[PDB]
Amino acid sequence: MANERMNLMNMAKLSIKGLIESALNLGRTLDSDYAPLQQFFVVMEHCLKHGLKAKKTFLGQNKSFWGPLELVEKLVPEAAEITASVKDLPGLKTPVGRGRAWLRLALMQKKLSEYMKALINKKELLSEFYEVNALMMEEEGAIIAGLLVGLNVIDANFCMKGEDLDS
């Protein structure tokens, strides 16, 4: 068990570290077309998927790692803005689809590293979604969360929607 967690950690390190080193020289606002960037998320998702439980949702909708993020707002003000955007965003059905988009917003706000730290420091509630020996409940959680700082300097900008029918 302890092995599976370490795998993701080191895997996340390269993601961040590399992504930063790749963004440094690049010197320009990144977008949803940068392979290294998209690579980061995938890794992140697997980290947030390690240790999940069953869906307690009344409507029986397994939110996966979405739920664990729905708590972020109830910990940091700046989160209640993006955690709402995804919702008021049509075309985005699947819960995981919301979480993936959420991260992108937390990435733009450069508050990602912050939020994550908030969760780990609240294993009192973060235990509802994750097991007792989950990644987000272990050292790796804090470690990676403390490393996501180097990403604050990154200037991303993803596309969510756009209208032009109204005059």
From Swiss-Prot:
* Reported tissue expression: Expressed in brain (at protein level).
Q: Which UniProt keywords apply?
A: Cell junction, Cell projection, Coiled coil, Cytoplasm, Developmental protein, Differentiation, Lysosome, Membrane, Neurogenesis, Oncogene, Phosphoprotein
Q: What is the annotated signal peptide range for this record?
A: none
GO-annotated biological processes: actin filament organization; cell differentiation; negative regulation of axonogenesis; nervous system development; positive regulation of axon extension; positive regulation of axonogenesis; positive regulation of cell migration; positive regulation of intracellular protein transport
Q: Where in the cell is it found?
A: Cytoplasm; Endomembrane system; Cell projection, Invadopodium; Cell projection, Growth cone
Domain RUN intervals: 31-163
Q: Which modifications occur after translation, per UniProt?
A: Phosphorylated by PAK1. Isoform 1 is partially phosphorylated.
In its UniProt record, a GO molecular function of this protein is: dynactin binding
Quote the cellular component terms of the Gene Ontology held in the record.
anchoring junction; cytoplasm; dendrite; endolysosome; filopodium; growth cone; lamellipodium; membrane
Q: How does it assemble?
A: Interacts with PAK1. Interacts (via C-terminus) with Ras-related Rab-5 proteins. Interacts (via C-terminus) with Ras-related Rap-2 proteins. Interacts with PIK3CA and PIK3R1. Interacts (via N-terminus) with FSCN1; this interaction induces neuron axon development. Interacts with DBN1. Interacts (via the second coiled coil) with GTP-, but not GDP-bound ARL8A and ARL8B. Interacts with dynactin/DCTN1 and the dynein intermediate chain DYNC1I1/2. Directly interacts with DYNC1LI1.
Summarize the protein's role.
ARL8 effector that promotes the coupling of endolysosomes to dynein-dynactin for retrograde transport along microtubules. Acts by binding both GTP-bound ARL8 and dynein-dynactin. In nonneuronal cells, promotes concentration of endolysosomes in the juxtanuclear area. In hippocampal neurons, drives retrograde transport of endolysosomes from the axon to the soma. Plays a role in the generation of neuronal polarity formation and axon growth. Implicated in the formation of a single axon by developing neurons.
Domain description: The second coiled coil domain is involved in the interaction with GTP-bound ARL8B.
Q: What is this protein called?
A: Protein RUFY3
